[PDB]
Structure formats: C-alpha cells, structure tokens
Symmetry: C2
Subunit: 227 residues, 2 copies
C-alpha cells in the first residue's frame, strides 16, 4: 500500500473540460454580470486548455440543443482520456426560478457521470467546479471531486467586470501551479486566496469561503502531458 | 504568497479530541454493535492520544450531563491549543428517530465551534469526523470527514469496529505524525473503498471529506 499513489495521467488525451453557463431564467443582465461571466469563461478556457483539456463551452439559453450537447457528452467515449472536468458558471444573486433551475441542472450533470453510467471514466477523476447561486448540492460517487465557490451558509461576492473572485482566484492558481501541485493542495490555496479577499462597498467585514469535497482515492497531478 | 503554508501547530497543547457516542433511541444493541462501538472508541482514543490530543469521551444516553459536557466544551478556552477534533460515532442502520436525532446533534455540535461562537479557535483547524447513519454547512478552517457520502452504502459494525474507523485509525497510527492530513484522509478513501464484504451486500463504501481549510495541516510530534 502506497501513500503516494496517484491517478494514471498518461492517456492519449487529457480529457474534456465542459464549461456550462447557466443563463436561462436570468434577465437582470447588467453589464458587470454579462462582462464578468464571459471573463470567467475566457479565463477558464485558457487555463484548462493549457493543462491539455479539450474545452467545450455551452449554455442553456436555447432549450433544445442543450440536450444535444448534453446527450453528446453522455455518449462520448473517455477511453483515451485521463479525466473529466465540468464547470458550472452562474450569476450571484438570482430569482428563485433561476436558483431552482441550477439545482436541477447540477443534479442532472453529475448524474450522467456516475460509474453507473460512464464506464469509460470508471476509476478516473471526475471533477465538478460549481459556482453556486442564491435565490440540493449533495452529489457524489467514487473518484468525484466537487468544488464549490461558497459553502451552504454563505456569502458570495457579486460578479464584476473582471469576473468572480472564486473563478479569478481559481484561474490564477491553475495558471501558476496547475501543472505542478497536487490538485487538492491547489484547491486549498484557492480557499485561502478567496477567503482573504474583501469588498465604498456596502457590506464589509464579510468573507466568502469556498469548500471542496473529495471522494478521490489517489493524488492528482496535471503534469504537462506527453513524454 | 506561499503554496506550502501550513497551520501553526506550535501551541502549548494539541487540543481536545471529543469522541461523541450517539446511543440514545437506538434499539437492538446486538453484540457486534456494542463491541464494535467500544472498539472504535478505544482505537480512536489511542490514535488521537498518540498525536498529542486530550481525548474526552461521552455519550448521549443520559446526559442531562450531556449538555453539561456540551456546554463544557462550549466555554473551554482553546487559546493554548493547535486545533479541535470532534468524532461523532453512531450505529450503522438505525430507526428514523435515531437517525433524525444524529442530524440535530451534529448540527448542534458543529454550530458551537463556528468562529462566531468560539473566538479561541478562530484561524485554527476544526475537524469533524462523522460516522453517518441511515434511517453540512461549516465555516472557515473546518474540515468535515464522512464515513460515507450522502446516503449510499456503509458496511455494518463488526466485533472489531467499523471499516471506516479501523482504516482511519490504521492510517493515523502509521502516517498521522508525518503526512498532510487531507493526504491521509485520501488514503483512507482508498483503503475503505477497496474493502469488500455476504447477503445482499455486493457494492462498496466510499468515504468523503469536505475541506474549508486554507493551509496544509500536519500533526508533527509536539516537542514536549
């Protein structure tokens, strides 16, 4: 038995990074919100591409080719891939319908990738990064890693023109440390950075604390892919 | 900014490790269950004591003096301590009342140690290890470790204890004083999920931990 066992990350491809933007049922689209969202998406696209991932982005605005894209990752073979990432982006304060729709969408997404339904990821890291939204975040399975921008209590800073604290901080760590540090050590750095930030704003003293929940059974590294 | 930053674990004392046994409302104390429970309690007492902790055990059978012991950790100062550990032990299948009671108890225990209520643990690791039972919000520097998942599958108690507790304690004993604590928990995920039972029972158990820690955590031998 080996305390330093890590996932085999020597497949032909890194795998897919699905970036899912939750937009339907949102209509307060102020400019900070719209500009922050695309920034977060762009920032994540670059960081994950640089880690070898094949990035696919889509949103839920059109309720017909969403299922397409959905079904479409459902049936994709991951035989030749190291792992799978899914990022769920949403806007900070939403109405109850927008928030309730997120919960169903996350429950659906995670359900698709359970060992029970995706044999080609059995034994491989299934990583979900969830930007939670305020108006059922209980998902799992072996080798899942669930990252949350904020824990169930809590306070999250609003979107800005440059994106959200959690996404910016995550991407900063990915770019600087992604290809070298163990992934959960990296997410721990993200806990610290985010929770250290602060808001003329009108609620001070407040902190956003991110959380990650690991059912991983080995260490996880994203060393540069090939030799 | 330092990728290797770790919690300062150089206080006078390691801190308290509270071992809480959820017993009330359980029916059907079979011998496996009763012997498993004390084994898990003994196993954890030795492992935590060896890591410097001041171990306190109690249960909910009685305790009018439960609140005593409760209030009593509530008001203890942890100024001279590195951290705080609470382990919540329960029996593997229980009735709905027993299970519902475990939820309230866990909500209450965790509630007590929030930065909002325990100033002397602010910025220190607050670690809850929960053996979940069948019929989650914490705070900065909380680490919640779960014998199982959500609802799922968990192996029943044996004479020697539960798989999760045995495997935890084995890792603690061998690696507790050297490895980063979430690395150790990851090893526990593997060990438990690799075990196999038989009747209707062909699956796994997969444990989970959820971290709001902001730094690496080690339990190196405290230098006396």
């Amino acid at each position: 038995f080996d305390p330093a066992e890590k996932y085999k990350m020597d497949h032909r491809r890194r795998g897919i990074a699905l970036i899912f933007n939750h937009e339907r049922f949102f209509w307060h689209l102020t400019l900070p919100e719209r500009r922050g969202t695309c920034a977060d998406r762009d920032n994540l696209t670059r960081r994950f591409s640089d880690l070898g991932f094949e990035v696919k982005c889509f949103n839920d605005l059109k309720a017909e080719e969403l299922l397409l894209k959905i079904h479409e990752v459902s049936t994709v073979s991951h035989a030749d891939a190291d792992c799978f990432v899914c990022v769920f982006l949403s806007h900070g304060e939403g109405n109850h319908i927008y928030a309730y729709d997120a919960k169903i969408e996350i429950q659906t997404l995670t359900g698709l990738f359970k060992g029970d339904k995706c044999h080609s990821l059995v034994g491989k890291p299934k990583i979900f990064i969830i930007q939670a939204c305020r108006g059922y975040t209980l998902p799992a399975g072996a080798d899942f890693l669930m990252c949350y921008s904020v824990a169930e209590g809590y306070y999250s800073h609003r979107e800005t023109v440059n994106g959200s604290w959690y996404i910016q901080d995550l991407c900063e760590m990915l770019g600087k440390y992604g290809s070298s540090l163990e992934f959960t050590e990296l997410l721990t750095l993200v806990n610290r950075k985010v929770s250290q930030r602060r808001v003329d704003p009108s609620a001070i003293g407040k902190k956003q604390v991110p959380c990650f929940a690991s059912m991983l059974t080995k260490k996880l590294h994203f060393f540069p892919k090939s030799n």
